[PDB]
Structures are given as structure tokens and as C-alpha cells.
């Protein structure tokens, strides 16, 4: 998606 983390 956009960037790993959220999620």
C-alpha cells in the first residue's frame, strides 16, 4: 500500500 506501519 502507501507504506508499511499503519498496517
Amino acid at each position, epitope marked *: 500500500g502507501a507504506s508499511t506501519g*499503519s*498496517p
Partner: antibody, heavy 117, light 108 residues
């Protein structure tokens, strides 16, 4: 070739501050967040925060908000964690680790912080 | 701010048995659950990410399962080298909380 270099040991007086270094090599520093994890005997593992150097995104566990301060020197590809107002409770092994659980998961050796006169 | 509950706290089992370690989340975390092995003096070793996906180099007798709030790590054909502490950690969002850990002893 991936490495996260941490000193084995830090010794610091109660009430003082310490800046634990995590020196990354073998990959582009800006590609991955660096997470900090506390391992204290009989307190299992505890996530402290991450600094994502690529995008200046810093996130803290609320418990460590005033306690911990994360920074990165992009030029020497080193993540720093500073603990403030140290007590015997802060004595522990502090790991730096790359990325989230996944293909990029990688751990430093851990820095044994002893808070003592 | 999701509570992660691990069980059992501690566990004894023989070589060749299957151990089942449980991790239960207070909220839905979808697939975003990891398992780590720790032995004393050593960095945590990632066993499983995204509930079911084995990390490079982990023996195939390790398998993670689950989704939502209900997760499990199974070690099939337990080996003497499997002794140590096992921690779940979610990677859903900050804070990335750990369960309390399971200490696994090999009976002999």
C-alpha cells in the same frame, strides 16, 4: 552483509541521560525504520518507538514519551535512542531492530544499560 | 492500544511432541501478528510474520495460524534446541505490543 552495530554496554549514574547508538550498514539507511525494544529480566519484551529516517516519521509507546528521544544521523546512517532521568528500572538490554516483522526483520546484538553509581 | 494475552506462561514437553502457544488480541489485528524465539544472551529470532509466513531459515516444523483476535504458534516434532522463550508481537500499528512470553522446557 546487513549489520546493526550496538555497543555491548553502557554504564550511567542515576538521574543522568544516555544516547544508545545503532549503526546500520549493508543497505540504504533511508529504506527502513529502526525500532527500539527493551528486554528486562522477567519483563519479557517491550516496544519503545521507531524512527523512519526516510520520511522523518518518529512514533513512541506512550509509556516512553518523556523517557525516550529518537533521532537519526542520515549522513553516518546511525539511529540514536536517548533515555532521560535514568533509574534502576531503566537497567535492561536495549535492542535496535530494522523494519516490521517481515523479510527485512534484523536485530542488533543489544546494549546492556546498567544504571549505577 | 491493543492488549496481547499469551498462554501458557510456561510449558514442559518431550522431544517429538507438538506444542501449541496461544496469543489473543483485545481488538481485530487481521493477519498482523509475529512470533519471536529468544534464548538468553541472544537477539530475538523472528519465526513467523503475518500470522502464517515463516521467516527465512526457520525449520518447517514451526507454523503460525489465526486471524482477527485468535492466533497460535505450533512446534511439531519438538527438538532439544527448541527450548527458550516465545513472544508474539502484533504489527497492526503503534504501539507494536508484545505478549508476556511463554517459557518452553524440554522434558527428558
Amino acid at each position: 552483509q546487513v549489520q546493526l552495530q550496538q555497543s555491548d554496554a553502557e554504564l550511567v549514574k542515576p538521574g543522568a541521560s544516555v544516547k544508545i547508538s545503532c549503526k546500520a550498514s549493508g543497505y540504504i539507511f533511508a529504506d527502513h525504520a529502526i525500532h527500539w525494544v527493551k528486554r528486562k529480566p522477567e519483563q519479557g519484551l517491550e516496544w519503545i518507538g521507531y524512527i523512519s529516517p526516510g520520511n522523518d516519521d518518529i512514533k513512541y509507546n506512550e509509556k516512553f514519551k518523556g523517557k525516550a528521544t529518537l533521532t537519526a544521523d542520515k549522513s553516518s546512517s546511525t539511529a540514536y535512542m536517548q533515555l532521560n532521568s535514568l533509574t534502576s528500572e531503566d537497567s535492561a538490554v536495549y535492542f535496535c531492530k530494522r523494519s516490521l516483522p517481515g523479510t527485512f526483520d534484523y536485530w542488533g546484538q543489544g546494549t546492556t544499560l546498567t544504571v549505577s553509581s | 492500544d491493543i492488549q496481547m494475552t499469551q498462554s501458557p506462561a510456561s510449558l514442559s514437553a518431550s522431544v517429538g511432541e507438538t506444542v501449541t502457544i496461544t496469543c489473543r488480541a483485545s481488538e481485530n489485528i487481521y493477519s498482523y501478528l509475529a512470533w519471536y524465539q529468544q534464548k538468553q544472551g541472544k537477539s530475538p529470532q523472528l519465526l513467523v510474520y503475518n500470522a502464517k509466513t515463516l521467516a527465512e531459515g526457520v525449520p518447517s516444523r514451526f507454523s503460525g495460524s489465526g486471524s482477527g483476535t485468535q492466533f497460535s504458534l505450533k512446534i511439531n516434532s519438538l527438538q532439544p534446541e527448541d527450548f527458550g522463550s516465545y513472544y508474539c508481537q502484533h504489527h497492526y500499528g503503534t504501539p507494536y505490543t508484545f505478549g508476556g512470553g511463554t517459557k518452553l522446557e524440554i522434558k527428558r
